[PDB]
């Protein structure tokens, strides 16, 4: 099982007739899905995975960049000295699952350890031809519509004590997020999240974070700065770019005694037309929103966090703020289990 890089191909259940923009890309860039795929459980097998150096991530990144670049039509695009003006009609936008598959002569190894921390050896290993269907949801702060951990919440980081490195939280229970632009200001919207469900989730996340900072008070705090796409929970719903003030979800402290025990939490949101692109450095202006209700209820299955560094002058308290921005971490949260291996 020697590991090497290999050009992947995709499989999806896209509809050849759909105008939905993910369906159009997959129809001419992927192949049909194997209805009953094979999966061989390897025995007495131990291999080393490294989610932070996975070429599968870089390959999926090039795909979704290519998708978005030939799909979303901004009225004006500003890309380093160049400025483009074109027609900007509204599009049908709803991501579909995309499987990633090894070519002939290669395979994919899937790590089935349910407490796998992202790096190091794995003992319960499978081999598949393709990954599970991954929805390429472009978002920040919150990871939407992903796949859950199978037992407990898991904290993943290339080095957890290195504040320069992002932290990817993977939940084991979904937390709903219902976002509506009600059919005043046509750019005004909001997202409701269950107060009890979210606060109970923060309790369990703090405990998992507490394992790498034993004792220590765990704190969640709002973003420290940056462009609107990362200070606010940013995501795309029906082709429109939502920007939600997430302060209400990162404003709490938890000590080794706070882990010891309806109504919504509704964040104010804006639908922006002037967006800061994530694929390349540049600014794109889109048309004002469509008329009618703009509703999409997604599943929060992960969090992107950045820990504050420096000697805390209080004594001992770790502060975690919502991060994101590099969409490779979004694909990473789904591709951490897999690696490509040449059949040998």
């Amino acid at each position, epitope marked *: 099982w020697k590991e090497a890089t290999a050009t992947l191909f995709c499989a999806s259940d896209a509809k050849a007739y759909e105008t939905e923009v993910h369906n159009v890309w997959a129809t001419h860039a992927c192949v049909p899905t194997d209805p009953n795929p094979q999966e061989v459980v390897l025995e007495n097998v131990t291999e080393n995975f490294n989610m932070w150096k996975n070429n599968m991530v870089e390959q999926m990144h090039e795909d979704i960049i290519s998708l978005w670049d030939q799909s979303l039509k901004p009225c004006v695009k500003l890309t380093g000295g160049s400025v483009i003006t074109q027609a900007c009609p509204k599009i049908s936008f709803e991501p579909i699952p995309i499987h990633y598959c090894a070519p002939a002569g290669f395979a994919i190894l899937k790590c089935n350890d349910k407490k796998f921390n992202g790096t190091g050896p794995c003992t319960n290993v499978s081999t598949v031809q393709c990954t599970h269907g991954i929805r390429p949801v472009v978002s920040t702060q919150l990871l939407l519509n992903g796949s859950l951990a199978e037992e407990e919440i898991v904290i993943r980081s290339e080095n957890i004590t290195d504040n*320069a490195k992002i932290i990817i939280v993977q939940l084991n229970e979904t937390v709903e997020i219902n976002c509506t632009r009600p059919n005043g200001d046509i750019r005004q919207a909001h997202c409701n999240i269950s107060k009890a469900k979210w606060e109970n989730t923060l309790k369990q996340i703090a405990r998992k974070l507490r394992e790498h900072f034993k004792n220590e008070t765990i704190a969640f705090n709002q973003s*420290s700065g*940056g462009d609107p796409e990362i200070v606010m929970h940013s995501f795309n719903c029906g082709g429109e770019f939502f920007y939600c003030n997430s302060t209400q979800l990162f404003n709490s402290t938890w000590t080794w005694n706070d882990t010891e025990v309806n109504i919504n939490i509704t964040l104010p949101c804006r639908i922006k037309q002037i967006i800061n692109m994530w694929q390349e*450095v540049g600014k794109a202006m889109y048309a004002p929103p469509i008329k009618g209700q703009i509703r999409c209820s997604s599943n929060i299955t992960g969090l992107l966090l950045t820990r*504050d*560094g*420096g000697s805390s002058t209080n004594g*001992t308290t770790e*502060t975690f703020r919502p991060g994101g*921005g590099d969409m490779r971490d979004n694909w990473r949260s789904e591709l951490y289990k897999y690696k490509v291996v040449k059949i040998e």
Partner: antibody
Amino acid sequence: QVQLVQSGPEVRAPGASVTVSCKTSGYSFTDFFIHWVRQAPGQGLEWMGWLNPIFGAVNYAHKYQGRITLTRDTSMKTAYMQLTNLRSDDTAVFYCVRKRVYDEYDWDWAYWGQGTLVTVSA
Amino acid sequence: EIVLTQSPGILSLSPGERATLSCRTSQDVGSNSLAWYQEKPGQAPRLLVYGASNRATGVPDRFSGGGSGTDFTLTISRLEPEDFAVYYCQQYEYFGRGTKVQVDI
């Protein structure tokens, strides 16, 4: 050749603000963090924060969180640091710094700016 | 947090002698993290050693870094007049409070 050029020395009164620029050349600006280090006469080298040029992501040290703001101008390949509510003992040399090799360890600071001396006096 | 105790604080030596600088961290940090810097008045600090033992570009073989668990050593084999300065221990964003070598013919 990687070059970090900072702005000239500044004199400020207590309570005033100061902004320091770091003009960058020699590499792809958006691929490296930019950190800022404070160098006081008897306090010897202190990290203040970093800015990720991809969007404007920042990390502020606890000691500076209320008083520091890190911004950038990717078009001009220039990083900026603003400090407010300057105290009598805030006199220091501030450095703009970058890491050694792309994609690798973030704290091996091989490239420093020449430094900007900020003198706080009434 | 991670405190880095550098000992001794002052180090008086003559050109030609050997200077052994100590640094001890509060936690185990492996053998490929700790870095050393040279601070001379009038110029920016200079990275000397990274990953505990790797010499940075442009530094002579007189400078040698060692150590693994919590004890690290920056050694200056022969100590030239250029080498009299203050040297800082670093891990992550944290710094030792420095150790100065002084000219004392």
